[PDB]
Amino acid sequence: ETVVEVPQVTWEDIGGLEDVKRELQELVQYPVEHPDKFLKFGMTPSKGVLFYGPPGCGKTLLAKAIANECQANFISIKGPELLTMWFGANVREIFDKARQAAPCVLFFDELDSIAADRVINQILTEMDGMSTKKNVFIIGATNRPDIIDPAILRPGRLDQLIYIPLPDEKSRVAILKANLRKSPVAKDVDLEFLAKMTNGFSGADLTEICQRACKLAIRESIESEIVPEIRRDHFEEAMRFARRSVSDNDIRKYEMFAQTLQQSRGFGSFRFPS
Amino acid sequence: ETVVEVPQVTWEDIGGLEDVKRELQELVQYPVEHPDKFLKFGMTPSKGVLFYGPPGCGKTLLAKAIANECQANFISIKGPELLTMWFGANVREIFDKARQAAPCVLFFDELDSIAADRVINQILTEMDGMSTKKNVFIIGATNRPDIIDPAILRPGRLDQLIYIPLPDEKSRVAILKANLRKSPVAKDVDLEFLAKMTNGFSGADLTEICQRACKLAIRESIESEIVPEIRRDHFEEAMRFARRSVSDNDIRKYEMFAQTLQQSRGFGSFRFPS
Amino acid sequence: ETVVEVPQVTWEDIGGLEDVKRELQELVQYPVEHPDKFLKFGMTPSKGVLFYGPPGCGKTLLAKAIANECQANFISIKGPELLTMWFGANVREIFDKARQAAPCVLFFDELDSIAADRVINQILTEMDGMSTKKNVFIIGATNRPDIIDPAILRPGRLDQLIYIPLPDEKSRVAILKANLRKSPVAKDVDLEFLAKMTNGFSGADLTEICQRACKLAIRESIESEIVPEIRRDHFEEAMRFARRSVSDNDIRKYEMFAQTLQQSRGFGSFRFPS
Amino acid sequence: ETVVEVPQVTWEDIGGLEDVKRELQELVQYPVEHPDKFLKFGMTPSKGVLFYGPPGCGKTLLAKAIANECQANFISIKGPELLTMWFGANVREIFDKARQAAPCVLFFDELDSIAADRVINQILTEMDGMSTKKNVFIIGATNRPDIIDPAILRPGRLDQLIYIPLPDEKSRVAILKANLRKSPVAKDVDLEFLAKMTNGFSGADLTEICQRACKLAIRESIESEIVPEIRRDHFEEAMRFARRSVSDNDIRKYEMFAQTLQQSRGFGSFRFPS
Amino acid sequence: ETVVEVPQVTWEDIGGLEDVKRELQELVQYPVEHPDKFLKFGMTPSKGVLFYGPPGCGKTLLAKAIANECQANFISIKGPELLTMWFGANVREIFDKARQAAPCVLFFDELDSIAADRVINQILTEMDGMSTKKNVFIIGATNRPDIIDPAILRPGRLDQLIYIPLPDEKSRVAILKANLRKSPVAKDVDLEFLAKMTNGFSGADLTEICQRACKLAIRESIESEIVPEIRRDHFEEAMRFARRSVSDNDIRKYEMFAQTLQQSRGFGSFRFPS
Amino acid sequence: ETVVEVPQVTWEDIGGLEDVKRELQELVQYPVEHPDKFLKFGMTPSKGVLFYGPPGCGKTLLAKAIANECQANFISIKGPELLTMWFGANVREIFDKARQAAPCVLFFDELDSIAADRVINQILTEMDGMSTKKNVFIIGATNRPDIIDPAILRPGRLDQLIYIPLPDEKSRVAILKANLRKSPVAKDVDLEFLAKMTNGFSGADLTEICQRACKLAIRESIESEIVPEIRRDHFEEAMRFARRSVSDNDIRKYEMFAQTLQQSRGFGSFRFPS
Ligand SMILES: CCSc1ccccc1NC(=O)C[C@@H](C)N1Cc2ccccc2C1=O
Ligand SMILES: CCSc1ccccc1NC(=O)C[C@@H](C)N1Cc2ccccc2C1=O
Ligand SMILES: CCSc1ccccc1NC(=O)C[C@@H](C)N1Cc2ccccc2C1=O
Ligand SMILES: CCSc1ccccc1NC(=O)C[C@@H](C)N1Cc2ccccc2C1=O
Ligand SMILES: CCSc1ccccc1NC(=O)C[C@@H](C)N1Cc2ccccc2C1=O
Ligand SMILES: CCSc1ccccc1NC(=O)C[C@@H](C)N1Cc2ccccc2C1=O
């Protein structure tokens, strides 16, 4: 059955970004931690955020981390589950579970997997009829934001289109440090220079690189058995066995989407003359 | 279940237009408040109106306000409800509820979401058999009036194709006043200049702008905690993050449709020679 | 349920045409009123006629009027009913009702709305197995006569393709008189000059014009209250709000269809040499 | 329910052709009337014939007449029945009825109405498993022989593709004599010259002409009432109200099909040198 | 129900070919009559063969004859049965019947009539799980071998793609002798010259010719009654009504397929140098 | 029912390759045989590999052999089983059987046969919810790797895309030795030169060649009866009866895919400067 627990992931786990972290805080923590000014001002707290960006960059990581920050249960519904709903009334049960688990951060991973459909409109019906007062917060993830119908992007539903970009160099070394730890590693590992060589490898690609280096370590030690730490040569040579999943054209079209939403923000000099 | 109550919205809440207000009064109030001349003249009161225009302009606001004016119950059926009936005889139950709640203003929000279909034809069957004597009044809203089948525009059904344009400058400041109010705001808010710099922002866009200014106020005050009114700088720095949802081409083709229906009205000099 | 009653409409109500009146008389009245020569001659009376023409010209009016002439019940099955049968065995019950109500003029309004289909084939099965002896007479209407499958136009079924053109000028003023009557109207209404200005407005358009004039009268009187006759200015200023529903291209292609059926009739000089 | 009776139609009714009469005789009468030589020779009697030709030429007439000649029950299944089978296991019941009614001439009118389908393959299954010994003979009719799948034209099924052409001049006058008879007619009716002026009118068209002339007779007599025989002028003028249903292009493509099946027969000089 | 009996057809009935006969013996007889060497060698007997070639050439005749040679039951499943299973778990019952009837030669006539499908996949599932030890032998026939999914041509399924060409002149006279016999025929029938003048007539066409000659004999004798052997003039005057069903282009593309499978076999000079 | 047993195939059987042998060893044996370093290092063992390559190269052979090496049960689900799942909840039963049989090597043969579908999504759901701790290891096979949806290639699922190329010349003679063995063969058989002539024959093609040689031996011995060793002439001549199943274009595009995955691996000089 669905697991409803507080994720152990933390902001330190993912160093991919910092502005998105603060935006998520203001979006989620403030309505629940400080429910004082929202009633004072003409603010109706947003109950929906949609994450978009290249695949395997940490959208699930961001959702889990923000759930951890507020110590609110986290419920994840995978894409295959929505697809079996499509091929296969239980969306109401999912939402009632989330409600009874409040405060909660419901998560819809790759909700665009189906891409007006039975399950999607059922989700819309259940989301619109959800009391915004309750602590339930809904987050969706999709690496193909364009193909999602706009009926989910209307007010009272998922509003904020948050972009999760490819990690930067400092961010990349942060993700590497996060992944390698909890296992033996040489005290003279480059890490930073490891990040610099990484041009456009996503978090998934860095995890794959670390996995391959560990695998080479196991192979070497197992051969020696018939050595207590991951030597430098492992990462030194395994990087030949590394590939960039996301093509530069994909990043450029993601940036085209972002620049569209930015030129939408392009309106300027309005400054209330004094 | 469906909520059947008199909306608290009022004409003051929306200042987008005035002639539409008057024609809505003549359409709805007159048959119910003054059922004295309709039977005198060869007039069969209209019982259906279809709103069309760019999305997020106040069609729902108009319907709620006109329901409030007559103090008649208001029943809304969202697009997702029709779509789930399409995917999923409940239309009959909806109409019986409306009948038992008479006087009432049944509202079909974005009824073109389905776009000859099963549910739409059931709606037509229930509407044609509805006694015009009863006070029930049916209103439909659609942001894409062209794709709607003509079977709904026939006499005895939704006849009046009303147009809801973008709010004008004075209307825009009226909407800003109607929305911003009920929350702290600086006494020296320009508002009028705020409306003038808004070129083609719809009511939804103005609401988003106000919400963003309020959000910035909350963030600033929360930082100060670790201030009691929405400063001017909030609006000044939030407008740069204001985007016009409806494109100029969309308004141009809406005006093309309106000009088609107007040149249909273009017949002129007939003046009953005397 | 289906209404089985003698329509109160009369030939006086519709002046659109006169030849069709006599042709319908010979089609319907003669087999029932004078069943003396049909068995004498080698003629099997026709039990089906299909009306075609631009929409809103009075096809239903003609059917109701001819039913009134013979004082025979009239059963109407609207397009939404056929289409809900299509989406949703009741055709047999409809025909049994017609039989038990004999003499009757069953009417299939816009039977081409479905456009070989399940309901169409069931209707054909019930019509072929219907005893031509019984007084029941079947009439169909279709604004789109071409898309109708030929399976219904075979002998023993809907055979006579009657055309209902736009009302003539004198016929237009006849329709005006038929409509505005039963309500106050100024003794000095031109009517004839009103019809002359009407270039190609159908009966529905004239009804809309009269309704708009009555609306203006209602509004003016209600304003005056806060006058007992529809003044000339009402029609004078409502005509500018009159639009011709049927485009001249539609009338031209209708006339192309008629000229096709006429050139089929174009065989000439055969004159029985003697 | 299905009617199983010996048709009263006779060869004298239809003078459309003579060779097809003899071919049908040899195909049907011989296997049943004189079942002697078939066993002697290496002949397996054919149990299927498919009629093709322009519509309304007498395929049903031919089937009924041949059934009459052998005094064998005749069962007809209309196209709408097959279509309701398609949209709607009763084919087995139809075939068992035909078997129990043996000798019988089962008739499938416009069996190509559906045009590999459920009902058609069910018919194939029931036909292949039908004992050729039994007197049952199956005849199919289709005015669109090309669109019929070839699975029905294999040996052991409908073999003989019999063409039913447009009636000749003498045949046309024979058809007229068959039609106008049994009702009053002037002793000085052309008939022969009536046929000559008829260029390409099918049997259905000639029946329509006779029906229209009778209709004019009824109209004239009933007008005189407010004359005991169909005068010459009725046919003289009603022929202006006559049309040729089948276009010359349709006849030419039917003849293209026939000439294909004839050049298939084009093999010549083989004469067994002696 | 399915008939399971040893066919009475024999190799003498069909003289279309001889090498195919021998290879069929080696395929079927050897595993069952002489199960002595297969286990000695690394030979897993084939349990599937697919016949392909122009229609009406004797594929069913070949299957029946080979079943007769081994005196093993023969089960035939016609194409309509597969199609009705497709439209309509009976494949399992068919295979259980074949198993209980072992030794048997299951035959799937025109199994490509459906042309990955439900029934064909069920057939594959039942065939793969069939113990090759058992005497059951599966043969499929299809005159359109290209459109058949390759899933059936894998090892452990129908392997051998056997080709059945048009009968040769000597083969044609053999077929004529096999068919004409058992009925009176003149002692001076050339037969051989009849075969020579037959250019590309298939077995079905030769059977049609014989049937037509017999029919003419019946007609002549039946006329003479109102003679005891089939005269030469019957064949002479019936040959002119003989048509070659299979076009030259069809045989050419069949030979294209055969030449493809032969050039695949075209690998040559490999000869084990010694 | 599904068979759960340790395959008797061994690495000595298929000599098609050597590198994939060690790769599969490190993938499967190490996590179960020596589960000492996996928890020490930060590596989560992979629980899924997907085989791709030209058909009939031994993918099933590799899976069975690797299952044999660890002495773990082996469950195979064929393509027709998945397709009857698609046309026909039992995937869960399959996985429960695999779990209860742990350690096991579940095999999905030609899982791309279906080519987001119901069965594929159910398989993904069952695979994601499968505890990686358990010894169960999942292997998939597809000779059309491109058409497979990427939903199965994400981390935590079938991850390692292993390529099974055409056997090398030494490998080809190894396969010949593995196949021909267990049956009589001459002591003076080329084998090596036999392999050299084999340019691009896959394992299935070599099996076909051996089967044809055994067939010829069977035929010659059976003729001689009416010799106890497979003579050289059998292979000498049967090679003229052999064909290469895989076209050089297919291998070229397979190598195009391989070179794509290699250029993805093309990142080079990263060598940890020191
Ligand atoms: C917004 C890019 S979404 C995306 C991301 C990764 C992988 C695939 C996709 N979708 C597509 O490529 C579909 C094609 C038609 N694109 C291209 C494109 C560029 C800029 C703006 C919008 C579009 C769009 O709809
Ligand atoms: C009437 C515009 S309705 C509309 C409004 C907002 C967003 C989308 C739409 N529909 C479309 O764009 C479909 C395309 C095909 N249009 C364009 C157009 C211009 C003028 C008149 C009629 C049409 C029409 O059918
Ligand atoms: C017979 C016109 S019925 C009609 C009437 C009003 C509105 C629409 C329609 N149908 C169409 O326009 C379909 C198009 C393809 N037409 C044009 C036309 C001219 C003359 C003859 C036959 C055809 C026909 O099939
Ligand atoms: C054999 C004429 S069947 C026919 C008869 C009346 C009315 C309609 C039809 N069908 C068609 O017209 C379809 C078109 C594609 N034709 C034309 C044609 C000429 C000669 C030979 C074969 C074909 C054929 O398949
Ligand atoms: C192998 C001939 S199969 C056949 C036999 C009789 C009647 C019809 C058919 N199929 C077709 O005609 C379909 C078309 C597309 N062909 C032509 C052709 C020539 C050579 C090789 C392969 C093909 C093929 O797939
Ligand atoms: C990836 C080749 S899988 C394959 C193997 C054998 C037989 C058939 C197939 N599939 C195809 O041929 C589909 C066509 C469209 N190809 C060609 C191709 C070359 C290189 C890279 C990718 C593609 C691809 O998607």
PDB file of C-alpha atoms in Angstrom, chain B residues 20-142:
ATOM      1  CA  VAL B  20     -23.680  43.695 -20.319  1.00  0.00           C
ATOM      2  CA  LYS B  21     -24.954  44.290 -16.787  1.00  0.00           C
ATOM      3  CA  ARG B  22     -28.049  46.088 -18.081  1.00  0.00           C
ATOM      4  CA  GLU B  23     -28.784  43.494 -20.760  1.00  0.00           C
ATOM      5  CA  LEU B  24     -28.414  40.727 -18.175  1.00  0.00           C
ATOM      6  CA  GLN B  25     -30.949  42.532 -15.994  1.00  0.00           C
ATOM      7  CA  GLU B  26     -33.367  42.804 -18.907  1.00  0.00           C
ATOM      8  CA  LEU B  27     -32.828  39.108 -19.668  1.00  0.00           C
ATOM      9  CA  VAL B  28     -33.267  37.684 -16.152  1.00  0.00           C
ATOM     10  CA  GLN B  29     -34.902  40.183 -13.780  1.00  0.00           C
ATOM     11  CA  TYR B  30     -37.693  41.365 -16.082  1.00  0.00           C
ATOM     12  CA  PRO B  31     -39.305  37.930 -16.690  1.00  0.00           C
ATOM     13  CA  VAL B  32     -39.418  37.236 -12.925  1.00  0.00           C
ATOM     14  CA  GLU B  33     -39.852  40.624 -11.238  1.00  0.00           C
ATOM     15  CA  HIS B  34     -42.289  42.007 -13.854  1.00  0.00           C
ATOM     16  CA  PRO B  35     -44.265  39.119 -15.398  1.00  0.00           C
ATOM     17  CA  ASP B  36     -46.896  41.647 -16.504  1.00  0.00           C
ATOM     18  CA  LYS B  37     -45.975  42.678 -20.052  1.00  0.00           C
ATOM     19  CA  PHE B  38     -44.402  39.481 -21.409  1.00  0.00           C
ATOM     20  CA  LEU B  39     -47.799  37.801 -21.700  1.00  0.00           C
ATOM     21  CA  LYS B  40     -49.263  41.080 -22.988  1.00  0.00           C
ATOM     22  CA  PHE B  41     -46.812  41.140 -25.903  1.00  0.00           C
ATOM     23  CA  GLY B  42     -45.942  38.319 -28.272  1.00  0.00           C
ATOM     24  CA  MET B  43     -42.779  37.734 -26.258  1.00  0.00           C
ATOM     25  CA  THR B  44     -41.513  34.331 -25.158  1.00  0.00           C
ATOM     26  CA  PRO B  45     -38.761  35.087 -22.615  1.00  0.00           C
ATOM     27  CA  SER B  46     -35.320  33.726 -23.391  1.00  0.00           C
ATOM     28  CA  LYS B  47     -34.133  31.054 -20.955  1.00  0.00           C
ATOM     29  CA  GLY B  48     -30.567  30.613 -22.212  1.00  0.00           C
ATOM     30  CA  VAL B  49     -27.423  32.710 -22.641  1.00  0.00           C
ATOM     31  CA  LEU B  50     -23.926  31.709 -23.748  1.00  0.00           C
ATOM     32  CA  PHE B  51     -20.994  33.813 -22.561  1.00  0.00           C
ATOM     33  CA  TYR B  52     -17.898  33.921 -24.741  1.00  0.00           C
ATOM     34  CA  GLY B  53     -14.603  35.753 -24.510  1.00  0.00           C
ATOM     35  CA  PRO B  54     -10.975  35.326 -23.504  1.00  0.00           C
ATOM     36  CA  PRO B  55     -10.495  33.187 -20.398  1.00  0.00           C
ATOM     37  CA  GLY B  56     -10.389  34.682 -16.929  1.00  0.00           C
ATOM     38  CA  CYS B  57     -12.430  37.810 -17.651  1.00  0.00           C
ATOM     39  CA  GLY B  58     -15.324  37.354 -15.212  1.00  0.00           C
ATOM     40  CA  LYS B  59     -17.929  35.168 -16.903  1.00  0.00           C
ATOM     41  CA  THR B  60     -18.358  33.239 -13.661  1.00  0.00           C
ATOM     42  CA  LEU B  61     -18.317  36.578 -11.849  1.00  0.00           C
ATOM     43  CA  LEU B  62     -21.049  37.890 -14.152  1.00  0.00           C
ATOM     44  CA  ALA B  63     -23.219  34.813 -13.609  1.00  0.00           C
ATOM     45  CA  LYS B  64     -22.799  34.948  -9.831  1.00  0.00           C
ATOM     46  CA  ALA B  65     -23.511  38.683  -9.739  1.00  0.00           C
ATOM     47  CA  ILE B  66     -26.683  38.393 -11.812  1.00  0.00           C
ATOM     48  CA  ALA B  67     -27.829  35.527  -9.595  1.00  0.00           C
ATOM     49  CA  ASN B  68     -27.212  37.775  -6.587  1.00  0.00           C
ATOM     50  CA  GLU B  69     -29.197  40.656  -8.082  1.00  0.00           C
ATOM     51  CA  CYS B  70     -32.371  38.551  -8.337  1.00  0.00           C
ATOM     52  CA  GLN B  71     -31.637  36.756  -5.034  1.00  0.00           C
ATOM     53  CA  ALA B  72     -32.068  33.432  -6.848  1.00  0.00           C
ATOM     54  CA  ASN B  73     -30.095  30.281  -6.071  1.00  0.00           C
ATOM     55  CA  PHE B  74     -27.014  29.572  -8.199  1.00  0.00           C
ATOM     56  CA  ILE B  75     -25.871  26.123  -9.339  1.00  0.00           C
ATOM     57  CA  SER B  76     -22.502  25.642 -11.047  1.00  0.00           C
ATOM     58  CA  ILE B  77     -21.380  22.562 -12.980  1.00  0.00           C
ATOM     59  CA  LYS B  78     -17.664  22.646 -13.731  1.00  0.00           C
ATOM     60  CA  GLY B  79     -16.052  21.344 -16.898  1.00  0.00           C
ATOM     61  CA  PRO B  80     -14.456  18.382 -15.124  1.00  0.00           C
ATOM     62  CA  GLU B  81     -17.914  17.251 -13.982  1.00  0.00           C
ATOM     63  CA  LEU B  82     -19.158  17.155 -17.577  1.00  0.00           C
ATOM     64  CA  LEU B  83     -15.974  15.398 -18.685  1.00  0.00           C
ATOM     65  CA  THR B  84     -16.312  12.713 -16.002  1.00  0.00           C
ATOM     66  CA  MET B  85     -19.948  12.202 -16.982  1.00  0.00           C
ATOM     67  CA  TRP B  86     -18.684  11.822 -20.559  1.00  0.00           C
ATOM     68  CA  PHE B  87     -16.075   9.239 -19.546  1.00  0.00           C
ATOM     69  CA  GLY B  88     -18.085   7.764 -16.671  1.00  0.00           C
ATOM     70  CA  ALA B  89     -28.383  10.267 -16.274  1.00  0.00           C
ATOM     71  CA  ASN B  90     -26.928  12.624 -13.667  1.00  0.00           C
ATOM     72  CA  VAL B  91     -27.722  15.581 -15.934  1.00  0.00           C
ATOM     73  CA  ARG B  92     -31.375  14.823 -15.245  1.00  0.00           C
ATOM     74  CA  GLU B  93     -30.703  14.906 -11.498  1.00  0.00           C
ATOM     75  CA  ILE B  94     -28.879  18.230 -11.853  1.00  0.00           C
ATOM     76  CA  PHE B  95     -31.842  19.707 -13.705  1.00  0.00           C
ATOM     77  CA  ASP B  96     -34.316  18.367 -11.132  1.00  0.00           C
ATOM     78  CA  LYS B  97     -32.239  20.004  -8.397  1.00  0.00           C
ATOM     79  CA  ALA B  98     -32.336  23.273 -10.337  1.00  0.00           C
ATOM     80  CA  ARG B  99     -36.102  22.946 -10.798  1.00  0.00           C
ATOM     81  CA  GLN B 100     -36.695  22.294  -7.099  1.00  0.00           C
ATOM     82  CA  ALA B 101     -34.442  25.274  -6.308  1.00  0.00           C
ATOM     83  CA  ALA B 102     -36.310  27.685  -8.588  1.00  0.00           C
ATOM     84  CA  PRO B 103     -35.745  30.599  -8.940  1.00  0.00           C
ATOM     85  CA  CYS B 104     -32.256  29.528 -10.011  1.00  0.00           C
ATOM     86  CA  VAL B 105     -29.449  30.345 -12.434  1.00  0.00           C
ATOM     87  CA  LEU B 106     -27.892  27.094 -13.613  1.00  0.00           C
ATOM     88  CA  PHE B 107     -24.333  27.654 -14.826  1.00  0.00           C
ATOM     89  CA  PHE B 108     -22.315  25.405 -17.143  1.00  0.00           C
ATOM     90  CA  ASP B 109     -18.688  26.490 -16.861  1.00  0.00           C
ATOM     91  CA  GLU B 110     -16.549  25.802 -19.944  1.00  0.00           C
ATOM     92  CA  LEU B 111     -19.205  23.512 -21.370  1.00  0.00           C
ATOM     93  CA  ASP B 112     -17.133  23.244 -24.567  1.00  0.00           C
ATOM     94  CA  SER B 113     -14.479  21.284 -22.651  1.00  0.00           C
ATOM     95  CA  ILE B 114     -15.842  18.133 -24.297  1.00  0.00           C
ATOM     96  CA  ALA B 115     -15.149  19.529 -27.777  1.00  0.00           C
ATOM     97  CA  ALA B 116     -22.548  15.920 -30.948  1.00  0.00           C
ATOM     98  CA  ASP B 117     -21.870  13.895 -27.798  1.00  0.00           C
ATOM     99  CA  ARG B 118     -23.790  11.787 -25.301  1.00  0.00           C
ATOM    100  CA  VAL B 119     -23.746  14.198 -22.358  1.00  0.00           C
ATOM    101  CA  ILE B 120     -24.251  17.338 -24.452  1.00  0.00           C
ATOM    102  CA  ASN B 121     -27.230  15.750 -26.198  1.00  0.00           C
ATOM    103  CA  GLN B 122     -28.676  14.680 -22.855  1.00  0.00           C
ATOM    104  CA  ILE B 123     -28.296  18.310 -21.771  1.00  0.00           C
ATOM    105  CA  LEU B 124     -30.137  19.450 -24.902  1.00  0.00           C
ATOM    106  CA  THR B 125     -32.917  16.929 -24.271  1.00  0.00           C
ATOM    107  CA  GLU B 126     -33.325  18.117 -20.685  1.00  0.00           C
ATOM    108  CA  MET B 127     -33.232  21.783 -21.718  1.00  0.00           C
ATOM    109  CA  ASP B 128     -35.806  21.521 -24.508  1.00  0.00           C
ATOM    110  CA  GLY B 129     -38.253  19.782 -22.171  1.00  0.00           C
ATOM    111  CA  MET B 130     -37.769  22.403 -19.455  1.00  0.00           C
ATOM    112  CA  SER B 131     -40.852  24.564 -18.949  1.00  0.00           C
ATOM    113  CA  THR B 132     -39.982  28.153 -19.844  1.00  0.00           C
ATOM    114  CA  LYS B 133     -42.698  29.218 -17.394  1.00  0.00           C
ATOM    115  CA  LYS B 134     -40.458  28.200 -14.507  1.00  0.00           C
ATOM    116  CA  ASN B 135     -37.911  30.733 -13.294  1.00  0.00           C
ATOM    117  CA  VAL B 136     -34.958  28.449 -14.093  1.00  0.00           C
ATOM    118  CA  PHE B 137     -32.424  30.329 -16.220  1.00  0.00           C
ATOM    119  CA  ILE B 138     -29.534  28.529 -17.927  1.00  0.00           C
ATOM    120  CA  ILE B 139     -26.184  30.192 -18.636  1.00  0.00           C
ATOM    121  CA  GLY B 140     -23.185  28.626 -20.350  1.00  0.00           C
ATOM    122  CA  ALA B 141     -19.588  29.811 -20.500  1.00  0.00           C
ATOM    123  CA  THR B 142     -16.968  28.926 -23.099  1.00  0.00           C
TER     124      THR B 142
END
